């Protein structure tokens, strides 16, 4: 009875009210901050009355009803507030915005930050939670509590130093970057659950956990996969309190059973709750058992393959995925899922034939092309990266992907391409052993970002097809894309290029993003133009901006921007 009291008791007041604030900010991204804190305070005091006595007036109501009613005390989403709960929650979920119209969170000076922090810490952490949550509505909520903890720790440690800035900005910039990466990674899980169903997330989990925990038995991995699937189903559905409590329970189970799971969890399990779970999720793959047999004896050579595939299909196929992921931490998860489906398709096609042994014995020989396609793509791209560097690699991927899907909005192309280019810096430094899972998992995260960003305002049929056919084939689908010959080139206009004198004082990131934006815009002018044409126009642009930024007068910018458009429409 009184689920709100149950969650209040398990999580404690501070985590409870932070998680309620996160849930409110993710449901209503346009609602201001004082509205939300007031609703959170009311919810928290009501939960206190409920834990005081669980028979009180409205204590047996569901968390969905309680939160929806509080949100509707103030609340486009006013359609949802005109709906009953089972559909109202689902309306709130459907109105989540991956790209909300909120301004850049520009940071003020450091002295004002430290004075606001010391003035009222609690309010200052609440504002941080509120802004992150409303700008990242699928953020993994307990991880967000860990980020807030580090955010406080940074403000506590730096504001008492001699130079407050030289302590503070590095760790804030790290928190900002790691938060963006965490948000994209969790977005992939939520998209997988919501669009491709529970069976696909279970298969992803089986593959990943069998790679990290190769010494565990299959039943152990199956239990962990069940609990993990439940946790992420709850967070991806907005039930953040349940999700946080069940994640803490899963971390507890894993720390109690390290002997049967992994020898690499010793140091993660001695840490406080939040970083204990964070450490478990990021832990290193354990060493695999020394004497593992070939996977042909029971899955290719056995006479019971068709027999067990019929009687125990689900259990047979995850056993295949489990045993094969154990032996291949060098493969990415998506490649392993591709291999499991190929095995399943071959079994369905061959168990209906006259001599099925002769039909499924050659499936491992169907694995070879699927395995060597990503290896060659990673080698070629890493090899281009070593020669070009991150910025040049980004521009090359940007021109390539702009040619592939030239209908996509310019800001989405720039962001995705830059995050694509960060593969080279993050994984190409690994040897061949462990850079394929790194690279191709990171690509699936960045491509999912492209898919959800394009989902809101679809303009390319090619994006929609790749994003909807098959989640595990999404990277090969995009890689196999080539120049859009049907796309009609775009004219330059007066608003196509908007370059003023503020570019001269820009940071290096923002200057790069503006140049990449121009590069996308003029690739859309002629998607056929070769490297040579592009470099010539880009270098004339680089000469333009450098000359106008040192003229004795924005007057240079207008006149030379007009000639730049006139000359670039020729070159």
Q: Which CATH code is given to the segment(s) 110-193?
A: 1.10.246.10
Nearest Cα to Cα of residue 396 among 359, 372, 424: 424
Task: Say which DSSP state 284 is in.
Answer: P
Task: Say which DSSP state 14 is in.
Answer: H
> What is the C-alpha separation between 138 and 232, in angstroms, rounded?
11
The coordinates were experimentally obtained by: X-ray
State yes or no: 484 annotated in a binding site: no
State yes or no: 64 annotated in a binding site: yes
> What is the C-alpha separation between 37 and 439, in angstroms, rounded?
41
> What is the C-alpha separation between 33 and 52, in angstroms, rounded?
29
Q: What is the DSSP string of 312-354?
A: SHHHHHHHHHHHHHHT-TTS-HHHHHHHHHHHHHHHHHHTTSS
> What is the C-alpha separation between 326 and 292, in angstroms, rounded?
9
State yes or no: 242 annotated in a binding site: yes
Helix ranges (H only) for 53-197 are: 63-72, 85-94, 110-119, 121-135, 141-158, 164-196
State yes or no: 454 annotated in a binding site: no
Q: For the purposes of burial, counting CB atoms within 10 Å of the CB of 93, is it exposed (0-12), middle (13-18) or buried (19 or more)?
A: middle
Same fold, 3-95 and 194-282: yes
Is residue 18 within 8 A of residue 148, CB to CB? The reply is yes
State yes or no: 232 annotated in a binding site: no
> What is the C-alpha separation between 413 and 398, in angstroms, rounded?
7
The owner of tokens 């948000």 is 183
Residue numbers after which the chain is interrupted (C to N above 2.5 A) read 75, 553
The answer for residues whose C-beta is within 8 angstroms of residue 455's C-beta and 6 or more apart is 98, 467
State yes or no: 237 annotated in a binding site: yes
Give the domain 377-480 fold: Serum Albumin; Chain A, Domain 1 (1.10.246)
> What is the C-alpha separation between 553 and 102, in angstroms, rounded?
34
Q: What is the DSSP string of 212-256?
A: H-TTS-HHHHHHHHHHHHHHHHHHHTT-HHHHHHHHHHHHHHHHH
User: Domain 3-95 has what CATH class?
Assistant: mainly alpha
The answer for residues whose C-beta is within 8 angstroms of residue 549's C-beta and 6 or more apart is 501, 503, 504
Q: Which CATH code is given to the segment(s) 194-282?
A: 1.10.246.10
Task: Say which DSSP state 79 is in.
Answer: G
State yes or no: 357 annotated in a binding site: no
> What is the C-alpha separation between 266 and 283, in angstroms, rounded?
10
How many Cβ atoms are within 10 Å of 107's Cβ, its own excluded? 12
Query: For the chain, how are helix, strand and coil distributed in percent, rounded to 5?
Result: 70, 0, 30
Is residue 26 within 8 A of residue 73, CB to CB? The reply is no
> What is the C-alpha separation between 394 and 424, in angstroms, rounded?
9
Structure tokens at 519: 């590069």
Question: Can you count the helices (H) and strands (E) in the chain?
Answer: 25, 0
Q: For the purposes of burial, counting CB atoms within 10 Å of the CB of 267, is it exposed (0-12), middle (13-18) or buried (19 or more)?
A: exposed
- The CA-to-CA distance between both ends of the chain, in Å, stands at 73
Structure tokens at 563: 């000639």
Task: Say which DSSP state 82 is in.
Answer: G
Is residue 134 within 8 A of residue 97, CB to CB? The reply is no
> What is the C-alpha separation between 331 and 325, in angstroms, rounded?
8
Compute the C-alpha angle 443/449/455, nearest 5°: 135
Helix or strand or coil: residue 550? coil
């Amino acid at each position: 009875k009184s689920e709100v009291a149950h969650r209040f008791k398990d999580l404690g007041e501070e985590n409870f009210k932070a998680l309620v604030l996160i849930a409110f900010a993710q449901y209503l991204q346009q609602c201001p901050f004082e509205d939300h804190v007031k609703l959170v305070n009311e919810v928290t005091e009501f939960a206190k009355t409920c834990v005081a006595d669980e028979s009180a007036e409205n204590c047996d109501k569901s968390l969905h009803t309680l939160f929806g009613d509080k949100l509707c005390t103030v609340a486009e989403m006013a359609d949802c507030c005109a709906k009953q709960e089972p559909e109202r929650n689902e309306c709130f979920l459907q109105h989540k915005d991956d790209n909300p119209n909120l301004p850049r969170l520009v940071r003020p000076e450091v002295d004002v930050m430290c004075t606001a922090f010391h003035d009222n810490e609690e309010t200052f952490l609440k504002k941080y939670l509120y802004e992150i949550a409303r700008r990242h509505p699928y953020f993994y909520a307990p991880e967000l509590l860990f980020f807030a903890k580090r955010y406080k720790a940074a403000f506590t440690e730096c504001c008492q130093a001699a130079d407050k800035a030289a302590c503070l900005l590095p760790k804030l910039d790290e928190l900002r970057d790691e938060g963006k990466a965490s948000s994209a990674k969790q977005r992939l899980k939520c998209a997988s659950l919501q669009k491709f169903g529970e069976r696909a997330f279970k298969a992803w989990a089986v593959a990943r956990l069998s790679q990290r925990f190769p010494k565990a038995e299959f039943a152990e991995v199956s239990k962990l996969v069940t609990d993990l699937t439940k946790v992420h189903t709850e967070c991806c559905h907005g039930d953040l309190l349940e999700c946080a409590d069940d994640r803490a329970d899963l971390a507890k189970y894993i720390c109690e059973n390290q002997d049967s799971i992994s020898s690499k969890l010793k140091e993660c399990c001695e840490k406080p709750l939040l970083e204990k779970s964070h450490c478990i999720a990021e832990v290193e793959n354990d060493e695999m058992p020394a004497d593992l047999p070939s996977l042909a004896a029971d899955f290719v050579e056995s006479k019971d393959v068709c027999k067990n595939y019929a009687e125990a299909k689900d259990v047979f196929l995850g056993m295949f995925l489990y045993e094969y992921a154990r032996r291949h931490p060098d493969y990415s998860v998506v490649l392993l899922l591709r291999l499991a489906k190929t095995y399943e398709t071959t079994l369905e096609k061959c168990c209906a034939a006259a001599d099925p042994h002769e039909c499924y014995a050659k499936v491992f020989d169907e694995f070879k092309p699927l395995v060597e396609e990503p290896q060659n793509l990673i080698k070629q791209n890493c090899e281009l990266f070593e020669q070009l560097g991150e910025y040049k690699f980004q521009n090359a991927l940007l021109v390539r992907y702009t040619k592939k899907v030239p209908q996509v909005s310019t800001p989405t192309l720039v962001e995705v391409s830059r995050n694509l280019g960060k593969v080279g810096s993050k994984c190409c430094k690994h040897p061949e052993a462990k850079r394929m899972p790194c690279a191709e998992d990171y690509l699936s995260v960045v491509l999912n970002q492209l898919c959800v960003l394009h989902e809101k305002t679809p303009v390319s049929d090619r994006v929609t097809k790749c994003c909807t056919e098959s989640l595990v084939n999404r990277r090969p689908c995009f890689s196999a894309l080539e120049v859009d010959e049907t796309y009609v080139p775009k004219e330059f206009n007066a608003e196509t290029f908007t370059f003023h004198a503020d570019i001269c004082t820009l940071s290096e990131k923002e200057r790069q993003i503006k140049k990449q934006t121009a590069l996308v815009e003029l690739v859309k002018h002629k998607p056929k133009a070769t490297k040579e044409q592009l470099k010539a126009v880009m270098d004339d642009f680089a000469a333009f901006v450098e000359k106008c930024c040192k003229a004795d007068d924005e007057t240079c910018f207008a006149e030379e921007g007009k000639k730049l458009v006139a000359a670039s429409q020729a070159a």
